[PDB]
């Protein structure tokens, strides 16, 4: 049984992306630990690494509004943060005119790939706008890895 | 150790999507070769195949602007190109009015799936607009396969 994780967002969290290890359809086993909102890899080897965030925003102050999602590695040795996977989305669009009330919008982002990882490596899935995090339903926000 | 690749875009490339085999967090091992911007599968079997492109465009001449991303197979025998994975996105929106200056936008696309491949099969991840390719930061553009 291979090192495996599939954690989800904390619904009872607070304009915050906080990974929860223990729910109904998640995984934290075979040596992978959740540690400071980071997945810690037990052994060395090839991992599939993936994540999805769903943003529900409201209003479009500008076309320049950006959503970001990024998975980063912190090697035990180096100890510095490196981006493995990363995407940016501009969800707007037009610009809500004023006197105009803001309308909701939905944007999902998905990241995923395979990487050679080292024992004791840390991994984090981070967004720029946790205030726009939507986890009002399950399956919408999640972070995972399996060793192959 | 299974046939594995995870190549990235050439930053020093030229309105071009050129796959680079040798960087810090990529993979080209166990028989997979990079050959004419195509991943060449060593043995037969089940592969996970995936890719992400990030487009940073500017201006919206029309609602009809399309971004495409597609992974295709070329079997040694047949020798003809077949689409395995394929998505299209319309990033606009409105139409920049004229006298109006163009504004930047970001659109990511992700493709990925598992397929039975044959020894000597070629695989390519192609976009329609390399002029809009954003790799100003790492983790933004990438192509990969692992044998399972």
């Amino acid at each position, epitope marked *: 049984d291979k090192p495996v994780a599939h954690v989800v967002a904390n619904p009872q969290a*607070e*304009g915050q992306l906080q990974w929860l290890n223990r729910r109904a359809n998640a995984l934290l086993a075979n040596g992978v630990e959740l540690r400071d909102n980071q997945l810690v890899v037990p052994s060395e080897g090839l991992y599939l690494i993936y994540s999805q965030v769903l943003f529900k*925003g*409201q*209003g*479009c*102050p*500008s076309t*320049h*509004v*950006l959503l*970001t999602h990024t998975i980063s590695r912190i090697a035990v040795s180096y100890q510095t943060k490196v981006n493995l996977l990363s995407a*940016i989305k501009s969800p707007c669009q037009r610009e*809500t005119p004023e*006197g105009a*009330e*803001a309308k*909701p919008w939905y944007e999902p982002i998905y990241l995923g790939g395979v990487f050679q990882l080292e024992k004791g490596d840390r991994l984090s899935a981070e967004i*720029n*706008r*946790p*205030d*726009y995090l939507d986890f009002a339903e399950s399956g919408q926000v999640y972070f995972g890895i399996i060793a192959l | 150790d299974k046939p594995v690749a995870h190549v990235v875009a050439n930053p020093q490339a030229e309105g071009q999507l050129q796959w680079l085999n040798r960087r810090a967090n990529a993979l080209l091992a166990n028989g997979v070769e990079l050959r004419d911007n195509q991943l060449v599968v060593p043995s037969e079997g089940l592969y996970l195949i995936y890719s992400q492109v990030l487009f940073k465009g500017q201006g919206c001449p029309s609602t009809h602007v399309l971004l495409t991303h597609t992974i295709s197979r070329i079997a040694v025998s047949y020798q003809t190109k077949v689409n395995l994975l394929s998505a299209i996105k319309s990033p606009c929106q409105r139409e920049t009015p004229e006298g109006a200056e163009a504004k*930047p936008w970001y659109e990511p696309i992700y493709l990925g799936g598992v397929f039975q491949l044959e020894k000597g099969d070629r695989l390519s991840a192609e976009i329609n607009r390399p002029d809009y390719l954003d790799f100003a*930061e790492s983790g933004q553009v990438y192509f990969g396969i692992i044998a399972l």
Partner: antibody
Amino acid sequence: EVKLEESGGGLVQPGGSMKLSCVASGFIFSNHWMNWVRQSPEKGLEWVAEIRSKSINSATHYAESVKGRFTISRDDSKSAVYLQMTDLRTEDTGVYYCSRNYYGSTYDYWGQGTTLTVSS
Amino acid sequence: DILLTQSPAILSVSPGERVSFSCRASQFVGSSIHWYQQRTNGSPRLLIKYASESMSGIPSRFSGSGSGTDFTLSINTVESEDIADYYCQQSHSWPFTFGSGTNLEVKR
């Protein structure tokens, strides 16, 4: 114009409570996100809390530094936003500004500030 | 929680000349940088939004630019009425943060 008027500052001992008030005119209040932003010479400008529109449910947001101590609320009927501060700290000392943030971007408008001095 | 550096903290310029304010983000913020003036005994006043778009009622002599992490506010033909502290703000990341501010002295 567009006016924001905050009030209710003054001296409190450490651990104390104090309620701040802000009355708005000159825009459709129920539409907009109201904020408190404080300023001190040591720390400069510091976002404190946001309360978004009805349409969002309230959607309240707090700075890490006041989480669980401060509570933001609004009375759309009165065009009012409130900051109820409890368990006050010396550091909480500063000028507190009522302010509108324009749908997650710019601080559109500012009141003229009200001063909190937390001290024995 | 993005950090904004405004160095130099003080600028001092003869009237008529052009002044430039620096704002640097510790990380990518796209163009979500906004600029404010704060006169003595005053509250902050929004000058420019999203790097370069000036608000209405704001004098033409104010402009901004920059993208990614390096940004600039510019006033040309500076005049004493411009004496203030100037702050930048990012809205790319939650929570929104401010720079420490640059002070403008117009010489005499």
